[PDB]
């Protein structure tokens, strides 16, 4: 049961710097017999590096490996913007989880708003309030429902976009799934934010049938 | 030139049985093993077996031991895999891989790889999708979308004004909702004062459904 764990999990930096990848093995390996893969959103796994030491035919020469026994490592130089995404270790049967390459930028505050649920859907027996988060790093954040003033839990799912290519911020928006007769039982509807860019957490409400 | 192109996306319901297949293009089918691997949607990669095109010989995860079969044709150059068995939690994607150029590496660094092919296992049956508007409210900018709630499958497409908008969009990912259905939101981000002349129209297309939804977008 030889299990990879390769870390960090997140890594964020800039073009142009270093990018050093750890890959250690649970017991002692093989060195002839090892894998460095490269996977970006939608596509399937690159072969970047076999043997922990070759490089695979046609990936360019800023990337190398090294290592034996135990611990394995991956570097890269000179990072160019399609060198972010996620890399993986792999020996025979056996794989690693992974560990991501993030694009590093100033700290970004998130645009909060907030969206009332509509007067179609409030027909079909169910409302839907939608908590939005604009343009905000890092990726970190916490969205918090609360009806009237009890904290909601359980009754929320997040989407979260990919890093934007050209600024590098993300976007966050959270969903409230309550009935109708819940919905008509209570007035205020809020959503706060926490995040590192904001000095205090922001709330943004509402108030039902106004 | 070496080339592996695999089926097209399939939904299943739990207790079936799907084959996906994986045809070879620019080297000899025979020469080399084929294997295959499965990927989460949310996790990452397991391996499920290999098979040799040139006896039919399998060896199959322990994981899979008895759930999975793979098959070859050698008058074409198509290597199948099933599984058999299906649960929910076997919504994954299947990709066919082949090892490198190299001889001694292994048989497991695989160079080659084809596109994958999605499977989804759910119970659900095919709905179209609702979408409800986003009205803007009260600084500098103001933002506004429409909700796209309970369709089934995956995906949709989300436009604005017919694609005459770009900057502002944000298309986020679907939520698998606990009723079986997705749902996802779309929202743009426009000037304030734009507000009562500019129209906004959302468009929502799903095509397992046969669906097409254009959608008013406007301050209530």
């Known amino acids: 049961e030889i299990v990879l764990t390769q870390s960090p999990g997140t890594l964020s930096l800039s073009p142009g710097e270093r990018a050093t990848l750890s890959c250690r093995a649970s017991?002692?390996?093989?060195?002839?017999?090892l894998a460095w893969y490269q996977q970006k959103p939608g596509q399937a796994p690159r072969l970047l590096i076999y043997?922990?030491?070759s490089r695979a035919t046609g990936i360019p020469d800023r990337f190398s490996g090294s290592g034996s026994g135990t611990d394995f490592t991956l570097t890269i130089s000179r990072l160019e913007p399609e060198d972010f995404a996620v890399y993986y270790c792999q020996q025979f049967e056996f794989f690693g989880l992974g560990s991501e390459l993030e694009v590093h930028r100033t700290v970004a505050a998130p645009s909060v708003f907030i969206f009332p649920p509509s007067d179609e859907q409030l027909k079909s027996g169910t409302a839907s309030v939608v908590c939005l988060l604009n343009n905000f790093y890092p990726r970190e954040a916490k969205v918090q429902w609360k009806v009237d003033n009890a904290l909601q839990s359980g009754n929320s799912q997040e989407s979260v976009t990919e890093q934007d290519s050209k600024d590098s911020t993300y976007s966050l928006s959270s969903t409230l799934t309550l009935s109708k007769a819940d919905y008509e039982k209570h007035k205020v509807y809020a959503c706060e934010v926490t995040h590192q860019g904001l000095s205090s957490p922001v709330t943004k409400s509402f108030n039902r049938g106004e | 030139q070496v080339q592996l192109v695999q089926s097209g996306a399939e939904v299943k319901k739990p207790g079936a049985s799907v084959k996906v297949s994986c045809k070879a293009s620019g080297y000899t089918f025979t020469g080399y093993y084929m294997h295959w691997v499965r990927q989460a949607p949310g996790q990452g990669l397991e391996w499920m077996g290999w098979?040799?095109?040139?006896?039919?010989?399998?060896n199959y995860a322990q994981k899979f031991q008895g759930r999975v079969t793979m098959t070859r044709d050698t008058s074409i150059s198509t290597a199948y895999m099933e599984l058999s068995r299906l649960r929910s939690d076997d919504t994954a994607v299947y990709y066919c891989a082949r090892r490198g150029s190299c001889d001694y590496c292994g048989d497991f660094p695989w160079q080659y790889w084809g596109q994958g092919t999605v499977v989804v296992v759910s119970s659900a049956s095919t709905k179209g999708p609702s979408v409800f508007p986003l009205a803007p409210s009260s600084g500098g900018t103001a933002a506004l979308g429409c909700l796209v709630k309970d369709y089934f499958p995956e995906p949709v497409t989300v436009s604005w004004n017919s694609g005459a908008l770009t900057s502002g969009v944000h298309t986020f990912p679907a939520v698998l909702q606990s009723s079986g259905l997705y749902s996802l939101s779309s929202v743009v981000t426009v000037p304030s004062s734009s507000l009562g002349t500019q129209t906004y129209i959302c468009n929502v297309n799903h095509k397992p459904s046969n669906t097409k939804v254009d959608k008013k977008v406007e301050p209530k």
């Open positions: 017991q002692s390996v093989s060195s002839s017999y």
């Open positions: 043997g922990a030491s």
């Open positions: 098979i040799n095109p040139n006896s039919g010989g399998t």
